[PDB]
Structure formats: structure tokens, C-alpha cells
């Protein structure tokens, strides 16, 4: 191959990562806010090169390569937790946050971002506006939220909606102090889950497209699908929903152009 | 003086310190339990010799000399706190327990007995039945309790007694676990308050009453009234409520016998 | 398989776990006490459900699946160690307790049960009755107890049976106090070690036996020997010590019934 | 006394305490910033009401009585130091800040106001902008500022104006991290200094100025001069520099009215 | 007064502060080594100005003024303790060291000099040669040395020279390691006690003797006795053991010259 | 095999570890000193048996098996750090010392030796002769040394080589004190890296050389190459740079003796 032919869709607007990562108030972990990111371009090397983030652990994908991939959808989950609970935001972990507040699936393709927010979220005299669910009958399914406020019966006696002996309120405040220990500062956590459905991808990295070159052995990056071959005109009539064609060997024979919406036939 | 004579009333019922120190369940610090001890002989040797009481700080009375004195009324304040906040139970300190839960007066005459109770008040998974008042409008008065449960407004919004943003429950749980450190481990605290007024003493030690030896220079202890003199037979007509007697110079010159109700002149 | 058949020997006495776990005085770690448990029914549910054991770590056996398995004999090793020495009671770990006091094998099968015992093993002023072996020439073998009290020759000079310079006593006191931190607090440790030999299993869980079903395909648990097959009456004669009849293919072909003493061939 | 009279000069402007306490960037402790507060009304109650301040130690004047008094001049000193070194801002105290950076007089009249400033002064990657003088040949005199950057010589070898072995820069960077403990936490300290010398007082509390009641026995606070008397007219020839007279008994008997510049007589 | 006359005895030999402080191995605190120091010039500013001692806290005398004083005898008591126990070497303090190992009288006059000794007194694997007395029936008297090794009876059972249950060895090892914390770190402590009683002075400071001038008003420092007066010839026949002279007014009116053994009349 | 033949060359001098480990002064971590050790005998068991080395971690070799295997060349890297960043001297670890001062490759072969030096590298009042590189624009490559003293521009403004606002000096002082904590105490670190490139061995340990026995199946160690064979005589034409010889089977079959320059055929 001589030169790569990158074809990405003609998207003009950047993804609203700034509003998600720089918002004034984040939600509590029991009622975490999920934002749907779609139909835009997202720069992921801005997040990595910024040294504000204490944690940038990515599972199932590499953080440096994130600008080269087109995901179908992005879900951004934002909440505030304790410092010692940051390690519970991982696939296959146990604890109060993992079981009762935010559960990550084992088959997780995404990145976990955690930065210290002692400056903006903590307050002297106590910031008790951040609460976490401490009591639940059963553990949470992955990507499930619990906003219930029913009194957790921890004994034989019914509670009748009144707090007291063995009847506790399900949500407990953190009590954040600026004079707290290293494990007790507020941490804002944004979990970026990359949905990779077999669909037209709408969140692409910031890569400049290259105009189409055919009839020669070239590299190509069609919607994040890297390959090498000769691109020719395809007689095959793809259905409108269909975006890829798979041979008997499960390798893409043809791809629908993401800019001019035509069919190109890949040959080795 | 030749010999020492001690005359006490013939009270043989032992004071209920077993109910105070060996109760199955204590109460929370916001609703600390007060017990009135009177009209019994008190044994403070069993408190002093015990090898479980980590803190035995006595204010206004010597801890070794608890057995010698006589009092009228004893107030036992039992509650459960954590280790770091045991130091707040003293005259003149600040903190959440001192300001909003239990305040000791600066003129406190009594002892503070604190011992670790990690085995009885901690449960694996958390023992949340012990609560403390965390928010209050104004600091507490000495020997004042606040068992009201009203939602504390921490902002400028009238939120109608529903927990949420800037409206917090007044009581917060300790959440005791056996794995927690000694700063956050349960400590049972019994505060003994002795009041010595111009009243006949009802709480005394187990000091034996000796025989009445008159017309000799003896050291004497009549119901806690120590001194030296030559006790003889009197002709004064005390009224039944009148225990001792005073001269023109406001010095004790006659006492009533605790046992046989006989008036004895103390000449020096 | 249509039905499930469980056959266990008709033994009814409970195993003396109460004597092991609720004893008033535990021995020191250098002279740890091993008790042989056999010929009884062991209910491991009462250990698991109760919330006092801070550390409950099983190696080689799933902790929640203790009830269904049958063991030949159980050895319970009890001792007292401080909080930072709890992590050394594990296979493959190092430390003073692992090298000189109690060493577990790398192939250990069983559970480690450690709970805080600050009330029973600490007195104010120091509880020095719990000693650990501090000096030894060589590390201990697995499950080997050393109670020798010769003076340790640290230097090049003969000790001559007197403590002095470069000659130390091998045992050293913990010195527990209730004010000490959780690293220096008493923990009572019971190590359950299960052996699975060719002997008949005597320590079985609280699972209840069912009726024997013959000539039909069932799923059977014969005294811990799980399997599936058509149980049929056999003409095989087993010697009294022999309990099962593995063939040339190392698969269980016949089992002696633990109650009625019947030889039962298994057809797949 | 029939009533109370408070006569203060007709000063309208509020004191610029917003530009001192809420300044964007404080100076370092080696070059601490001193601001002269005069000719304005000062409200010290609003400083005491805020719970942001973690240290409000006032020496020689009580914090509750701050609004009552009047002063001629206020010296507002501001700097940033770590949490462990807050205690060295005290009269008759020793330390690095006391010897080399900021020394208070042994008889100091004012308030040391220190609050935690983690949110304003810390940043990720460390805020090293705040420097403290660590090396000096001699200890600092009280209220003396040293901004010399000469290289301190520790050994006999002359430094020659370059950094090297035994020749160190006199200023050391603090190294404030958001993840540091409370010991190394950035704290902003404001040291208010008051002069009690007799002069025309320019700064007073927010107390309302009442009318002038003559020939009736009233309490008075004439520009901070507390007393009780019958305020009558005077025929004394007060010169312009003379603000309050005195008698042969060295007691205050004639005070100039601050608003009218009219001499009044205090009659007991 | 015109001149100042210092007369000290003609001694030149320096007493071994080097052997006290720079010894290779010190002694344990239960068997602290006391050395008698007499007939020497002692340069206390060598110990004061050297940046080697972490603590140089002096009781009853100023450390800077020690060069200008003369004492009859100096006791140097050297031992090794831990960092947290350095505080306990003081009058009116409690602990294990103060009660059982080294006790200081309440009228103590001297200095306590403590410096860290990590490289000398620690070893990887534990340095156990430094022992402290942990058990004693009664508290120690001031300056009492106890080197007895008898088994402490902490219970009712006789011990009979065998260590075991409730029978402990009285000496307990520190167990120093170089990786230990600064509280558990080996500190060498030397306590200097000065006999200021009425006796011939032997230990004197490095002040140089000046020539004797008579019949004028001069300040004088005769063997550490300071005054102002006129020195003249005296007819008082002193007995050879007598140094000072005194009258009914309890004032020193005659002294003996340290060098010429001449009796001088101090006329004021 | 019958006996083992260990053949080491005729080397008489010892490797100069004395000034590497027991030098009076060490260099700082930014200017880490490197010493090349070759052509001598090194006794690693002296370092192994030392009672002062707290950390003796090794990578790519066993800490027990370092003496018997002998290496081509030894690079000794010496620097002083504090106790917290001892863990940062490991491959793959991230930190200030790792990124900016001393970086080890991920395939590092050798041993890290660290020991506390609080009595040598700390002085009362502070020892500031040991510096570390705090700021660098890029992370260091493995084994590169950067001693540049250029002013680190931390802001946008060009300040032209002067210290000031965001123009920090790159080096900073540890500031060791004897009373500091174990994290802030000096630790001398000697990294002993070894390369195993294709070259004749120059440093080998103190193991003695045995006489040759030919025509018998003996275990042999020919200067780091260990095998089993019948070392018969040869007739090879080995050029003087050929240390050993390999056949078509890619196995060692001819070794020239290091002590006699005689080629020996290894026959299986
Ligand atoms: C949030 O604001 C800061 C301040 O300018 C900026 O550096 C950062 O890049 C912003 N975050 C995002 C995701 O743009
Ligand atoms: C953008 O892409 C669409 C197909 O996705 C195409 O129809 C349209 O013409 C493109 N816009 C421009 C300006 O080329
Ligand atoms: C509580 O019970 C224990 C049980 O032996 C006893 O020793 C102790 O004296 C009791 N407490 C009081 C105050 O009597
Ligand atoms: C006991 O005291 C009472 C006073 O209440 C008295 O009446 C009675 O006689 C006394 N009894 C004896 C045996 O002293
Ligand atoms: C020990 O005694 C307690 C007392 O309630 C009981 O709950 C526990 O089950 C006992 N332990 C065992 C192993 O039976
Ligand atoms: C109990 O087991 C024994 C086996 O030794 C057997 O002989 C006996 O019949 C059994 N009893 C019952 C009631 O099953
Ligand atoms: C600084 O700003 C805060 C913001 O609300 C305010 O509450 C405070 O009073 C201000 N400080 C002063 C001295 O005015
Ligand atoms: C304000 O004070 C000045 C002098 O103190 C006086 O001359 C003037 O009349 C006053 N004005 C008012 C309105 O009181
Ligand atoms: C101990 O030896 C060192 C070595 O130079 C010396 O500086 C110090 O002054 C000596 N101390 C005494 C008390 O002699
Ligand atoms: C030294 O002092 C003695 C008295 O103790 C005296 O007899 C002698 O003459 C003195 N010598 C000198 C040289 O001053
Ligand atoms: C000493 O070394 C030389 C050169 O390496 C060698 O030729 C000689 O044989 C050696 N000496 C002995 C006794 O082997
Ligand atoms: C450094 O000196 C000590 C002094 O005994 C010695 O034990 C040690 O072996 C020396 N270090 C080396 C590397 O030889």
C-alpha cells in the first residue's frame, strides 16, 4: 500500500464533552446522570494530555488510540464519590458503591476518568449535598440506577416509613471536609462507555478525511474499520440499513461510503 | 485526737451501678440516659479496680478519694460515642458532641468513665443503630438533651420537612464496624455527676459505723462532716429536719447521731 | 436425571464448634491448640451467617458451599495474634508468625476465621499473657509447633542459660491494651483445615438424607461422592474397609450405601 | 443612668476588608503584604460570624468585644503558610516562620485569623508559587520584613553568588498538592494589628451614633472612652491637638465631641 | 563599681564529656550509667552550639548561662530510650520510664540532652540489647537505680522463678529497627544534674581568672558566688574547711580566695 | 556426573565496592553517580549478610543466587533519596524520581540496595546538600542523566533565566532532619545493574577453581557456562577471540579453557 484513504462522515460540530466534564454541580452516585453523546466529533487526546485527571484507566481499549476509532454511541456517566471508593469503579469489583450505587459489567469497553474535586465540591462546615445508597436488598445489575427512598428494614420489625432502631434511611450523606484525609476528598468520576453496535457510527475521532482514491492497493479507514485493499465499484445493491458486507470468512467485502453514500468493493 | 469515729446511717442496699455499667443496650448520645442514684450505699472500689476503663478522668474530686466522700444525689449519664470524640466529654471543649449532643458545665463536679465496647456495639457490615445530632441552630446548654427530629434547613429554601438538597436529617449514624480504627470504634461513656448541697447525704461509701465513744478527743466523720472534737451529750432540742447545728460564729458545734437520732455537742 | 438422591450416614451429634470458637482462654500462637473434630455433623451455616468474624477467608473451598461437602476429619487450630499479623495466616506469606509461630502449607485446604477480641484479651495497663515466638534458627515447617524455650544465641558468645547481651528469650509478649490501635489489638484466629483422604467421611454437613431410588437414572451425592447414573443392586462383595469400586478408567463404578450397607453399581 | 450615649465621628465609608480577605492572590510569607486601614467604619462582627475561619485567635482583645472599641490605625498583614506552621503565628512563639519569616511582638494587640485555602491556592501538578525564607543569619525582629535574596552561606567557603555545596537559595517553595494532608495544606493567615495609643481615632465599629443628651446622667462611649457621668458644657481652652482632658487625679473629665468639635465636661 | 574580678581555681584538665557523649555503647534505661564529674573546666557551649542534639531542654538553669557558673559535683546519667519516651524524662511526669526506670526529683536542677541514634542503635532484623524495666511493685524514688531481676507476680499464684501465666520477666526489650517510625526510634539521653549546695566548688566554667584588686568597689565572682562590694584584708581566722563567711543578716561578708587561700572581707 | 568442575580465570584483585557503598559522601539523585566495575572478584555475600540494608530487592536474578552466577560487567549507580520514593526505584513505577530524576528500563536486570542513613545525611537544623530534579518538560529515557540547571518556565511569559513567577529553579532540596519521619529520612540507594551481552565474563565471584579431569563425565562450569559432558582433548583451530564453539546442532561442544587456553570437546 502507498497512502491511506480515511473516509469519515461530514460532521461539523464538536461533541459536548466540555459541558459534561466542567459542569458546576454533578449528581450523586445513587442518581448518576447519563448523557447520550451522538452525531458529533470528539477529541480524546485533549483529555489524556491534560494532567488534571488522577485516574485514566481504560478497559478493553487503549486510551492513546481513542482518536482513531468511530464508536456508534457514547454514554457519559457523571457522579461524585469518595477517594477510597474510586477503586470500586472497575469491572468485577465489590464494595458499597459497586453493589448498591454503580455497577460496571465484566464485558466493559470504555474508560474510567477520576479527578480530585476538593476545590469545587468540598466546603468547610460540611457539604452534605452528595449522598450514596448504603442499604439495598440486592446488588445492582450493570448500568442500573436506584432512586428509591424506601426505608431499609434490617430487622424482623416493619418500619412503617419511620427511621429508628434497625430501620435506616437508604441514602447517607458523605460529609465532605477540606481538612479530610487523602482518602476522603470528593472525586468526580466520568465513565465513558463506548457503544459499538453494528450500525452507522456517529461519534468519530478528530481525523481529517482524505478524498477517495480507487483502483490501487491502498490503506483505508472507513468509519474506524481499518483495512488494506483495492477499492473498486461494486455492482451489489446494499439495502439502506446495511452498512457492511461480510464474506464467508467474516471479513468485510464491501463498505458503504460515509460521505457520498455509495458501495465500494474491497479486493485483496 | 486519740481515735477516729465514723457514724453513718444503717443503709445496706447497694447502689444500682450494675444497671448503669452492665446494661445490655445503652442509648444514643443525642438521647443520653440519665439515672438518679440516691438512698443507697455506694461502692466505688469496683469501678476503680476494674481493668477495662481506659479513661477515668475525675473533675473536682480525686479519683482515689471517691470512696471517702458522701453525696446526696448522683446523676449517671450513659451514652455511646466514638474514640476521637471521647475527649469532647470534658468541661470547656468543643466539637459536634459538645455543641449539639452533650455539653458538660464548666463547674462540673464528677467523673467521666469511658471504656472500649468494640465487641458489643459493632457488627460486620455496620452497626447503624447509634446516632448523633450533627446539625443544630444553636449550641446546647449544659445537661440539656434535644430529641426533636426536625429537618434542618442549611440554605434559604423552605423544603417542608423533606430530605433533599440543603435539607438534611438532624441525626447521623455512627456505623460501627469491628475493622474500624480506634478513632472510629465504639466507646461507652458513663458520666457520674455528684451534687453536694445543704441536704442530708443519701449516697455514701461502705465505711463501717463504729461504736459511739464520748467524752474523749476523737477525730469524727458524721455523714461526711469531717473534723476533730470532744463529743458529749447535748441538751439542745433540734427539730426533726435539723441535722447538724451551728453556733453564733457559723461553726459546727452540734450534730445528730445518724443511727440513734441523738444530738451530740462537739466541743473542741 | 429425574430425581436427586442424597445418602449420608445416620449420625446426629453436632460437632463441638462451640468449644472451639467460644472458649474462655485461647492459647498463645507459639503453642497453638489443635483439636481433632470427627464423627459428628458440622453445621457451617452458624459460622457464616453470624456477623462477628472480620476475616473469613477460605482457600481451596468456596466459603458458601461448606454445607454440602463431607470431610474425613477436621483440625481446628486456635491462637491469638495482633491485627497486622492476621494477613500472615495465609498460604505463601511471610512474617514473624509465618516463619516462627504458625506456618500454613502452600497446598492448604480450608478457611481462616479471625475476629476481634479486644474485650476478652486486653486489660488497662497491658495484657502480657499472650506471647509469640520471636527468635528461631530456621523457619517452621507447615503445621509444626515449636514450644522450645532455650535462650537464642544471637551473637557468637554462649548464652549459658541466662538472658543478657546478645542472648534473648525466644518468647516475646504482645502487651495488649484497649487503647492500642487495630494493628496492635487482639484478634482470635481459628484455622479450619480439612483433609480429604481415602477414609470414610465422618464430618458431614447438615444436609438431610433422602430415600434410595434404584433402577432409575438419578443424580446422587453418596457421602460426598457426587455423580449421575442408574443405581442398581449389585452382586459385588466389598471388604468392610472398602467403600467404593473404581474401575480401570478411574471412574466410580460401585458405592457402598452409608446407611443400609448395600453395594450399588453405577451405570452411566 | 437615664440612657446611653454613643458619639462617633461622622465617617461614612466602609472599610476595604473585602480587598484584603477576598483578594485573588496573597503574597508569600517572606514578602507579606501590609495594608493600612484608617478613616473608615469597620464591621468586625461579620468576620466573626463566618465559620470559614479555622483559627480566630485574638490576643489582648476579646473577639466578642471587637465592635465596641475604636482604634487609631489597623495594620492588616496577609500571607500563606502550611497547616503545621499556623501555630507559629503567636506572640512569644518559635519556629521557622517566627525566626525567619514573620515575628509577632511579645505584647501584641490584635487577632490572628487563619483559614484553610485549599480551593483557592492549590492546583494539580503542584502550586509552587508560595515561597518561605528558610535560611537567615539572624532572627527577625518583630514586624520587620526581609525581602533579600542573597545566597545564604552555611560553610566557610564563600558562595560567590552561585548555588552549590553548602550555599543554598534563601527561599524554598512550599509544594502544595491537592492530595496533601492537612499538615501541608495551604492556609491563608490575616494578622490584624491594632494600636491602642492615644490619638484621634479613625476606625471604629458599626455602632450607631446617638444624639447628645446634656445635664442628665448617661453612660457614654466617646470614641471608645467608656464611662458614666453627667455630660455638661465646658469652658476649657482645648487646643486642636488635645482630644480628651484629664484632672489632677489622672481621670478622664473632659472630652471633645467628635462630631461638633465642642468641649464637654464629664460630671460624676 | 569600676572593675569586675573573677577568681576561679587553677585547674586546666577538661573532664570527659567526650567519654559520656561519644561512647560506643550506652547502657539500658533500667541500669543507667552514672559518672561523677569533679575538678575540671566544663565548656557547656560546646554542647549547646553544636547542631547534633535534637533536645537540649534545661530545668532550673539557663543553657546559655552555664559557662558562668560553678558546681560542686556533676552527675552524668546516660541511657537509651525511644522517641515517644523522651518526654517522660522530666519532673512531675508519668509513664513506664518515669515510674519504673528513671525518676527525676521535683527540685531538679540541670539539663536533659537527647539525640537520635539510628545508625548506632538499630539493626535490620531488630536490636534487642536495650531493655526497659516494665514491672515493679512500687514507683521509683528519685535517682534510685534498680537492677534486680526477679519474676514479677502479677496474679495470686507464686512464680517460683519460672515465666508463665501472670508471671513475667521484669525487663522488656525495645526491639529497635531502622525502618521504625520516629516515635519508636532510638534516642540516646544524657541527664546532667548539678549539685548547687554549700560545698567547695569543683566543676567550673571556662571563664578566665583575673588578677585580684583590693580597696576599691568592684564586681566579684568568687568561685561562682556573685556580688558587689569592696574587698579588703580580713582578720577573720577561717577554719580550713570553711569557704564563705556570713553574719546575722544572712549575707556573705567574707570569702576565701580560690587561688591564694586568702580570706577577704567584703565590705559593701 | 561424578564431580563438578568450576573454572574461573586467574584473577587476583577484588572489586572496589568499598567506595561505592562506604563512601563519606554520596551524590544527589539528579546527578546520580555511575561506576563501571570490571576485571575483578566480587563477593556479593558480604552485601547479602549485611545487617543495615533495609531493602535488597532484585529483578531478573535471584537475591539468593546472585553470587554463583557471574556477569560480564557491573554498573553501580549511587544516589540519595528519601524513604517514600524507595518504591519508585522499581521498573515501570511512576513518580517524580522515576520521571524526572532516575528512570529504570522495564527490562532492568539487577538488584536495588537501599539503607537508611539518618545519622550521616541529616543535621540538626536541616541538611540541604541533597537535591532532586523536580521539573522537566519531558519524561526521562531509561538510564540517561540530566544535570542541566536551566530555569523551568512554568508559565507563558519568558522571564530570561531568573527565578520568579512560574520560573522555578529545576532542583529542589530534600531538607533532611534527624527528627523527621521515616518517609522523610535519607536513604542511600545503590542500584547494581548488570548487562548480559555477548562478551567474555570479567567479574566472577570468590569460588575456587578445581583441577581439570578429562575423559570422564563431569559437571563443568566454564566461566559462567554450565553443562554436563566428557571433556576430551581437541585438535581445533580456535582463533584467539573465540571463547567457545558450537556445532551444527546449536549446542556448546567446544570450550577453550580460561586458565590454560586449551580447547576441550564436550561430548554428551
Ligand atoms: C475545563 O476547563 C478548563 C479550564 O480552562 C480547561 O483547561 C479544560 O480543558 C476544560 N475541560 C474540557 C473537557 O474541555
Ligand atoms: C454530507 O454527507 C452527506 C451524506 O452523508 C451528503 O449527502 C452531503 O452532500 C454531504 N455534504 C456536503 C456539503 O458535501
Ligand atoms: C459488670 O459485670 C462484670 C462481670 O464479671 C463484673 O466484673 C463488673 O464488676 C460489673 N460491673 C459493675 C459496675 O458491677
Ligand atoms: C437504724 O437507723 C434508724 C434510723 O432511721 C434507727 O431508727 C434504728 O434504730 C437503727 N438501727 C440500728 C440497729 O442501729
Ligand atoms: C458463641 O456464643 C454466641 C452467644 O450468642 C452464639 O451466638 C454463637 O453462635 C456461639 N458460637 C458458636 C460457634 O456456636
Ligand atoms: C444406621 O446405620 C447403620 C450402619 O451401621 C445401620 O445398620 C442401621 O440400620 C441404620 N439405622 C437406620 C434407622 O437406618
Ligand atoms: C468574601 O466572599 C464571600 C462570598 O459569599 C462572602 O461571604 C464574604 O463575606 C467575603 N469576605 C468579606 C471579608 O467580605
Ligand atoms: C461632620 O463632622 C464635622 C467634623 O467632625 C463637622 O464639621 C460637620 O458639621 C459634621 N457634619 C454632620 C452632618 O454632622
Ligand atoms: C564527638 O565526636 C565528634 C567528632 O568530630 C565531635 O565533633 C564532637 O564534638 C564530639 N562530642 C564530644 C562531646 O566530645
Ligand atoms: C594553684 O592553687 C594553689 C591552691 O589550690 C596554690 O597553692 C598555687 O600557688 C596555685 N598555683 C598557681 C600557679 O597559681
Ligand atoms: C595466571 O594467569 C595467566 C594468564 O591468564 C595464565 O597463563 C596462568 O596459567 C595463570 N596461573 C596459573 C597458576 O594457572
Ligand atoms: C562498611 O563498613 C562496615 C564496618 O564494619 C563493614 O562491616 C561493611 O562491610 C563495609 N561495607 C562494605 C560494602 O564493605
Author numbering:
A (entry chain D), B (entry chain A), C (entry chain E), D (entry chain B), E (entry chain C), F (entry chain F): 322 to 589
The authors write:
We next hypothesised that the homo-glutamine hydrogen bond conferred by the Q484 sidechain provided an additional contact critical for dimer formation. Accordingly, we introduced the amino acid isoleucine at position 484, which possesses a branched aliphatic sidechain capable of providing hydrophobic packing contacts. The cryo-EM reconstruction yielded a dimer-of-trimers phenotype for the Kappa + Q484I S protein variant, yet, with a reduced number of picked particles comprising the dimer class (46%), relative to the original Kappa variant with Q484 (74%). The Kappa and Kappa + Q484I dimer-of-trimers are structurally very similar, with RMSD values of 0.262 Å and 0.705 Å for the global and focus-refined atomic models, respectively. The oligomerization state of S proteins harbouring charged residues at 484 (E484, K484), along with the Q484A and Q484I mutations demonstrate that abrogation of charge at position 484 is necessary but not sufficient to permit dimerisation. Rather, a combination of charge neutralisation and additional contacts enabled by sidechains at position 484 is required for S protein dimerisation.
